[PDB]
Amino acid sequence: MFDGELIAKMVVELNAAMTSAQEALQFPDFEVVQKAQPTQQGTSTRPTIFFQKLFDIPRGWPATDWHLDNTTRKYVEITRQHVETTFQISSLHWQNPEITHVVTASDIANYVRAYFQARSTIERVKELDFLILRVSQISNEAFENDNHQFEFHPSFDMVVTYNQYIRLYENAAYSADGVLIGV
Amino acid sequence: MIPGANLLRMAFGVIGTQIVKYRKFEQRVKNDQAQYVSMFEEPFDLAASVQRVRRDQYVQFNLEFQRNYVMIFANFEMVDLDRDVAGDQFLWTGRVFQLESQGSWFYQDGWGVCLAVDIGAAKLTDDGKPTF
Structure with missing residues (x-):
């Protein structure tokens, strides 16, 4: 639902x-x-x-x-489950030998990681209802693109923590009818 | 003799030919970052039959790619990848093509067949000509 x-x-x-x-x-x-x-x-x-x-x-x-609706005397139960999703965040940028201002797909992936691990972005993301855990590895691997050249497709896993809320119904009660039996 | 002469030259008498802008490898040096830069001779026109190869899309890393191919029969010595050598390059329909395979037949007969893969859109000159 999230x-x-x-x-x-x-x-x-x-x-x-x-x-x-x-x-x-x-x-x-x-x-x-x-x-x-x-x-x-x-x-x-x-x-x-x-x-x-x-x-x-x-x-x-x-x-x-437990939340009372106060109208139908029904206890709406709110089941909050905490969740750590894992996002595979990758980058793709072909590298031109002729150009001089070279920037590698590894640079873009590394900058995304470092931006998303900075504390200001953490606080902003907190204001947007989730957070970010540590990224412990960025894997730069090589493959062949469709032009029979060589390309790098770096990727890393970012763990995002949040909550998801479930609403269900239960019956209420405002009475206590005990039976005091003697041994 | 038939393995001599030029069979593709004779065959060009009946079937039509497409004019491609061929360009031959000259030398290649490494720029900075150990990436390695190729340089070429002057472009020149070439009469060749550029037939198709069935190009089928595929999936890699959950993306979709497709390698574009053309099989070129040309009456010239065409050399692809080699030890201490990079492949040649020809322009057709405003698209760059680099040779991948090599059917040889040159020193036997004078012609050759090569499988070539599209590289990208050609650069457009100021006058509208589709060459680099």
Whole structure:
């Protein structure tokens, strides 16, 4: 119930990180995309950042709070489950030997990581209802793109922690009818 | 003799030919960052039959790619990747193509066949000509 809103907020933050990355170092434009496109649509020549969902690890038992609706005398139970999702955040930017202001896809991925681990961005993301854990590795791997050249597709896993709320119904009671039996 | 002569030259008498802008490897040096820069001879026109190769899309890293191919029969010595050598390059329909395979037949017969992959859109001159 949250991955849509989370993906929207993550897209906003990723586009912000790309706007910042346009300042320190320079790229010809940028794009932020979800890796598994639900319809056939191509990879982009421009330097882009991909993000994708990998897991979802609930953390701790669900916490149930009881809220009275006061109208129908029904205890609405609110089950909050904590969640650590894992986002695979990758980058793609072909490298031109002729140009002199070289910037590698590793640079873009590293700058995204360092931006998303800074404390100001952490506090902003907190104001946007989730947080970010540590990124412990950035893997720069090589492959062949469609032009029979060599490209790097660096990627790292970013853990995002948040809560998701479930609303259900239960019956209330305002009475106490005991039976005091003698042994 | 038939393995001599030039069979593709004779075949060009009946079938039509496409004019591609061929460009031959000259030398190559490394720029900074150990990436390595290729340089080429002057471009020159070449009469060749550029037939298709079935290009099929595929999936890598959850993205979708597709390698564009053309098989060129040309009456010239065409050399791709080699030890201490980079491949050649020809322009066709405003698209760059670099050779991937090598059918040889040159020193036997004078012609050759090569599989070439598209690289990208050609640079456009000020006058509108589609060459670098």
